[PDB]
Write a protein that binds this ligand. Structure first.
Ligand code: APR
Ligand code: ZN
Lengths: 294, 12
């Protein structure tokens, strides 16, 4: 049904529709408290997010019980409560903006194309959008990018119809390259610089925490393992199983909004309210850490 | 070394 967007029909959709698992309240309470300890005691924390952190906004995931691939695989279409334009950042989106402001998040690697991290105000220089961003187009000639307020209008790295305006020939001519969407199709190369930065942050983290991804798509799904190579720790947060459950130092099965609400509570940090779509290109210097909670 | 394409597979 996605083709349509003229996307490849030859993808391997992975394991779709596995049962959800829910930790009982007491265990969960225990786990989120342990998470806070890890986040406070680690000096370099990298988060990795997937489609599961945008479900509370009305965007479906891919392989959940009602995921877009899960439904397709069984001959059904999925259902969209919201458009990408009208989607609102969730409490988890807003929590990550705050973590970064206070220095508790070194970097954020996302697989999501819904544009919400950017639109929530998350600074672009701490973010790798490894699979693209429905609001971003890019010059085929010169790689310069343009962030738009509306979706760019194609997927699969196709010409959007606009042209590049960067200055060429010592100021005499415009680039005029075709702008293209940045939505990777199946088996496209990841963007070099986002991957190189995501890889660097993952290899250097001493804590990687995954949120709302079943980790089945590489290489983004393999980045949280890099941390374990230097003896850092891995935390997986997800309702379904994930491909790398056996490497987790801490596994939490619960709703991300609920997990991040509590985490912030233990950390002493309010979750900012969202004003509306606001692009921040570069991080501010860090606000000071809150009073040591433990 | 090893590919940087969006797909399903190992990390080794
Ligand atoms: N509110 C929630 N809280 C916690 N977990 C959740 C929530 N909502 C959904 N989940 C879980 O989030 C996970 C999302 O996994 P996938 O749908 O596989 O999405 P993701 O891992 O981001 O997919 C990777 C890639 O696959 C692609 O085809 C698309 O390119 C995508 O970027 C699912 O396992 C689902 O159980
Ligand atoms: Zn250009």
């Amino acid at each position: 049904m996605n083709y349509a967007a003229g996307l490849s029909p030859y993808a391997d959709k992975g394991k779709c529709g596995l049962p959800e698992i829910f930790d009982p309240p007491e265990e969960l309470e225990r786990k989120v408290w342990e998470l806070a300890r890890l986040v406070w005691q680690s000096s370099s924390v990298v988060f990795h997010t997937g489609a599961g952190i945008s479900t509370a906004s009305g965007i479906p995931d891919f392989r959940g019980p009602h995921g877009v691939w899960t439904m397709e695989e069984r001959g059904l279409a999925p259902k969209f409560d919201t458009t990408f334009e009208s989607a609102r950042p969730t409490q988890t989106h807003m929590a990550l903006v705050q973590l970064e402001r206070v220095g508790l998040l070194r970097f954020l690697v996302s697989q999501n194309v819904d544009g919400l991290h950017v639109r929530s105000g998350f600074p672009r220089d701490k973010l790798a959008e490894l699979h693209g961003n429905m609001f971003v187009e890019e010059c085929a000639k010169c790689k310069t990018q343009y962030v738009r307020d509306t979706v760019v209008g194609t997927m699969g790295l196709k010409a959007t119809g606009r042209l590049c305006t960067v200055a060429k020939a010592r100021g005499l001519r415009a680039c005029r390259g075709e702008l293209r969407d940045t939505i990777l199709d199946w088996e496209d190369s990841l963007p070099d610089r986002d991957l190189a930065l995501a890889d660097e942050a993952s290899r250097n983290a001493d804590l990687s925490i995954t949120l709302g991804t079943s980790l089945q798509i590489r290489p983004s799904g393999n980045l949280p393992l890099a941390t374990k190579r230097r003896g850092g720790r891995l935390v997986i947060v997800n309702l379904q199983p994930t491909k790398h459950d056996r490497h987790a130092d801490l596994r939490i099965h619960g709703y991300v909004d609920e997990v991040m609400t509590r985490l912030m509570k233990h950390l002493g940090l309010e979750i900012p309210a969202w004003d509306g779509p606001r692009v921040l290109e570069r991080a501010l210097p860090p606000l000071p850490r809150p009073p040591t909670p433990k | 070394k090893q590919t940087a394409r969006k797909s399903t597979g190992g990390w080794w």
